[PDB]
Amino acid sequence: SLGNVLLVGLGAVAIQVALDLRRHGAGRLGALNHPGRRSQRIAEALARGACLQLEGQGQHRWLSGNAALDVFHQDPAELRDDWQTLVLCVPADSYLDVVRGLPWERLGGVRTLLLVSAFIGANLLVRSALPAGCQATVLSLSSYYAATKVIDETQPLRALTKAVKRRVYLGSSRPDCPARETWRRVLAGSGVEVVPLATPEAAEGRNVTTYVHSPFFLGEFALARILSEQGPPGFMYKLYPEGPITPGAIGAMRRLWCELSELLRRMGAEPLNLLRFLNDDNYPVHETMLPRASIDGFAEAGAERQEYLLFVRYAALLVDPFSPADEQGRHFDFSAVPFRRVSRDEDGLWRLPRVPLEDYRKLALIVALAAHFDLAMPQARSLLASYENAVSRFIDCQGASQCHPSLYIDSRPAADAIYRQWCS
Amino acid sequence: SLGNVLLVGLGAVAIQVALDLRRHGAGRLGALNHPGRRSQRIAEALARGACLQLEGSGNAALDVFHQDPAELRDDWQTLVLCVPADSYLDVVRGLPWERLGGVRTLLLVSAFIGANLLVRSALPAGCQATVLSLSSYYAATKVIDETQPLRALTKAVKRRVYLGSSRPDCPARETWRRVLAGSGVEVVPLATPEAAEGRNVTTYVHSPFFLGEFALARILSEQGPPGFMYKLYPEGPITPGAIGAMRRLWCELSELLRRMGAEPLNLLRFLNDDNYPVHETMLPRASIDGFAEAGAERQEYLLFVRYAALLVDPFSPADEQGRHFDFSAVPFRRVSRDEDGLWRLPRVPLEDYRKLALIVALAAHFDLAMPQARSLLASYENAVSRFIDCQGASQCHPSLYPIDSRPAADAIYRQWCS
Numbered sequence A: 001s002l003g004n005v006l007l008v009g010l011g012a013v014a015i016q017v018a019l020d021l022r023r024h025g026a027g028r029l030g031a032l033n034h035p036g037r038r039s040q041r042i043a044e045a046l047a048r049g050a051c052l053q054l055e056g057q058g059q060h061r062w063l064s065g066n067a068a069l070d071v072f073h074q075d076p077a078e079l080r081d082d083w084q085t086l087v088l089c090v091p092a093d094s095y096l097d098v099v100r101g102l103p104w105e106r107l108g109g110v111r112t113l114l115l116v117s118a119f120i121g122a123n124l125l126v127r128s129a130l131p132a133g134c135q136a137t138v139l140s141l142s143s144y145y146a147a148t149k150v151i152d153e154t155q156p157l158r159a160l161t162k163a164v165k166r167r168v169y170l171g172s173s174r175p176d177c178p179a180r181e182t183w184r185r186v187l188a189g190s191g192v193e194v195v196p197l198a199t200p201e202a203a204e205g206r207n208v209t210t211y212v213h214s215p216f217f218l219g220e221f222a223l224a225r226i227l228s229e230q231g232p233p234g235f236m237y238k239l240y241p242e243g244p245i246t247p248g249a250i251g252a253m254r255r256l257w258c259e260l261s262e263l264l265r266r267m268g269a270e271p272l273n274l275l276r277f278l279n280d281d282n283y284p285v286h287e288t289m290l291p292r293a294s295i296d297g298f299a300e301a302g303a304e305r306q307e308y309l310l311f312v313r314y315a316a317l318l319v320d321p322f323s324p325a326d327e328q329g330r331h332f333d334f335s336a337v338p339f340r341r342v343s344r345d346e347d348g349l350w351r352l353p354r355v356p357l358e359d360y361r362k363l364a365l366i367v368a369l370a371a372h373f374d375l376a377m378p379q380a381r382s383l384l385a386s387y388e389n390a391v392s393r394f395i396d397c398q399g400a401s402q403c404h405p406s407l408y409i410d411s412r413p414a415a416d417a418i419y420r421q422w423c424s
Numbered sequence B: 001s002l003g004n005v006l007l008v009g010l011g012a013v014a015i016q017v018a019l020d021l022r023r024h025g026a027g028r029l030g031a032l033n034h035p036g037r038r039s040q041r042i043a044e045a046l047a048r049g050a051c052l053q054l055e056g057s058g059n060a061a062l063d064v065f066h067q068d069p070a071e072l073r074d075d076w077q078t079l080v081l082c083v084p085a086d087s088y089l090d091v092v093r094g095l096p097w098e099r100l101g102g103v104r105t106l107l108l109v110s111a112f113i114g115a116n117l118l119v120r121s122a123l124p125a126g127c128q129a130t131v132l133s134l135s136s137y138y139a140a141t142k143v144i145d146e147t148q149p150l151r152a153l154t155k156a157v158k159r160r161v162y163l164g165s166s167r168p169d170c171p172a173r174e175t176w177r178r179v180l181a182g183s184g185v186e187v188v189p190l191a192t193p194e195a196a197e198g199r200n201v202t203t204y205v206h207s208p209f210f211l212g213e214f215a216l217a218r219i220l221s222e223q224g225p226p227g228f229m230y231k232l233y234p235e236g237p238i239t240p241g242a243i244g245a246m247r248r249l250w251c252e253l254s255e256l257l258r259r260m261g262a263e264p265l266n267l268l269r270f271l272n273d274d275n276y277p278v279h280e281t282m283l284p285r286a287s288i289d290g291f292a293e294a295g296a297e298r299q300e301y302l303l304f305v306r307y308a309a310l311l312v313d314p315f316s317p318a319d320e321q322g323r324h325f326d327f328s329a330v331p332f333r334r335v336s337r338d339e340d341g342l343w344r345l346p347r348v349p350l351e352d353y354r355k356l357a358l359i360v361a362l363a364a365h366f367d368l369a370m371p372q373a374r375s376l377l378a379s380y381e382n383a384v385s386r387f388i389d390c391q392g393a394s395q396c397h398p399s400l401y402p403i404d405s406r407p408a409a410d411a412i413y414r415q416w417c418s
């Protein structure tokens, strides 16, 4: 079924996936992670006899478990044609690099390649990069299915999952793909429902971070906090001035959802009901805050009501309404996630965190792809311009010499490869 | 033009008013406080040399103290009613107006819609008193401890209040504008009492938030978490439905005001500019100014944003994480037993229900049904009725029992038609 499974990227996502794969019965389980301090620490832990450990936080404690890794490679030169499934647990903005870098001459036996956090066009981009006559099926999971992080970077094999989604979606480059059911079962082991959809793009159209991170973390407030060294970092999911959520950001969310929905229609995929997707598939609120009739009717409700409902949705989740109250009546503050900020790497160069660099790169690629379908996407373009102007001013102030080149891009080549692949 | 001033209701408000009067300049200062334990402490305190003491700050002598309205001499040019607004009618009916022909001015410090008219319906034919309606008390003031009953603390002062008069061209109205401005508040004179009476925030806010199901469940509970007055569900009562009630009630109140000859208010502009502002990023100035013409969905959204935006004080200083001060964590005051062992309701929502009950009864005379106001009244009446059922009427203070506001409404309407 899954045969021997190679995990590409061994970070927080991979450890959760490894636990679900070992429950199911991979066969051999290996991992590849490019050189660096993390891979060094992993090789050291593995050589010490360490195993992967997943802790579930609070409600999720029942997830907790340990999983053995059979082999770990930080050097593709030692890979052999032993692998039937590849699972990409790297950042989604690196899929193209990572796929180009695999030694496909020694991977003819690969039958399936799973993208754990896909975005519109990712399946096609990955297939554009495969060698001729590669017969691996490429699977797109709509979103990573939990919230997981490596708590202590010096114990790189221990991760903590603090949330699990209710539902995600899975598409495949192979029509009526049988691997979808396999992965349905693997993810079911952690309580998430996988819904198979007919094409990759339908599933990719349900990537939550594209819809949420784009309006909230490419705007002025988020960028100001992220690109700062001194002030308070602020909070990713709180209201202004503690966090980035404002009526303006909600209006960007709505308008971007409309643009992405039209792109999906032009690629033959059914768009989603954004409010019902957030509430039912990701995390709910009470009927008192969002009535069922309002959730189900959201797509026909009219722009003012749509924005009102989205704002309510996020305001209602400043605390967890389903957590127990303390004696004062307070509920758990789970909008208190700090923004990660710029930091210097081991060469002394400023680097951006994945929020927003991955978010920008994904949206920039989507915008470039949309041009091929004659779609201007002005709200997306405005969010890209907001990021570009902010990062530009940070380079102005800090000095280009001090900045990693990832802060300096052209998405049109990759978008052209995607469109050509789509047109084959 | 103030002359000798009689403060009726010698409490926190009266002590602030007394100092503002003394700063301005007045004659003798008197007070009338009805019999009770507070009056006994005042009498003793006065006997021991006490004076009115305000801390923000100053001292003021009291020249005369009465408990019995029948003992008043015709020595008073101005009366200031500093009692709960639900007692205004009672206070006025109890005064010997036929031998108080020297009173020229009566000031109502916290007037509700129709209060000016209700007070006047109780005055004798021929009575020459002008009645002034202040939109609300202009400060936050408390008597710290009842062992020093004449010593009050003012915590804060409002930016703006509104003042109207039963007499079209009214010298006393400018005097009082100046008197109260000594606290730092801006007093905006308006052309009728009802215009001022319609500019009281509690009517618009306390009604939809604190007469609903969530608030009543907290208020009537003895055990459990008290909850918070200005938080979102489930920590507090604020929900889209409560915001919808707020909008619809504002529409109903605004039409009542128009039929009574008063220009209504822009609710969002009033909250933002008279109660507490938010940043442009949350409520643009143009959205605030355009609220009255925005249309119901947008209006509800803007109101919800307003309250969500004030779950923390956006103008407070941030901590090291970037958190701002949590000034929505005002806990519900709940029922408590009085000295006689009888359950009492807090002023919120008791005074708020009483005010809205009168407003609805009055509005009926103007051919206005007020369905949203009536739904809030019924929610209060049903919850308190159940509380009485459970605790026992013998165990409940009579202020919990049903009231009938129609006689007062009728008197207001008759006065307004004269």
Ligand SMILES: NC(=O)c1ccc[n+]([C@@H]2O[C@H](COP(=O)([O-])OP(=O)(O)OC[C@H]3O[C@@H](n4cnc5c(N)ncnc54)[C@H](OP(=O)(O)O)[C@@H]3O)[C@@H](O)[C@H]2O)c1
Residues within 6 Å of the ligand: A008, A009, A010, A011, A012, A013, A014, A033, A034, A035, A036, A037, A038, A039, A089, A090, A091, A092, A093, A094, A097, A098, A117, A144, A146, A147, A148, A149, A150, A209, A354, A358
């Ligand atoms: N964790 C979550 O809860 C979550 C939630 C939503 C979405 N996601 C999505 O899942 C993706 C992976 O998340 P994660 O939390 O597991 O990231 P992670 O913990 O940072 O690790 C991913 C792995 O990929 C390696 N890596 C990073 N960049 C690479 C590159 N350009 N080329 C090759 N390898 C690279 C990393 O090693 P080095 O550090 O040495 O580079 C690391 O081992 C995220 O990017 C996002 O797309 C995750």
Ligand SMILES: NC(=O)c1ccc[n+]([C@@H]2O[C@H](COP(=O)([O-])OP(=O)(O)OC[C@H]3O[C@@H](n4cnc5c(N)ncnc54)[C@H](OP(=O)(O)O)[C@@H]3O)[C@@H](O)[C@H]2O)c1
Residues within 6 Å of the ligand: B008, B009, B010, B011, B012, B013, B014, B032, B033, B034, B035, B036, B037, B038, B039, B082, B083, B084, B085, B087, B090, B091, B109, B110, B137, B139, B140, B141, B142, B143, B347, B351
């Ligand atoms: N204080 C504030 O900061 C504030 C803020 C907003 C609104 N308000 C409103 O302004 C008004 C005054 O508030 P307050 O704090 O000064 O109340 P308070 O401290 O209770 O004082 C009221 C005084 O008037 C007496 N009193 C009650 N009914 C009377 C009557 N029929 N005749 C004569 N005296 C009577 C009371 O004596 P007993 O106690 O013996 O009854 C008490 O001494 C209230 O309506 C209040 O809801 C006040």
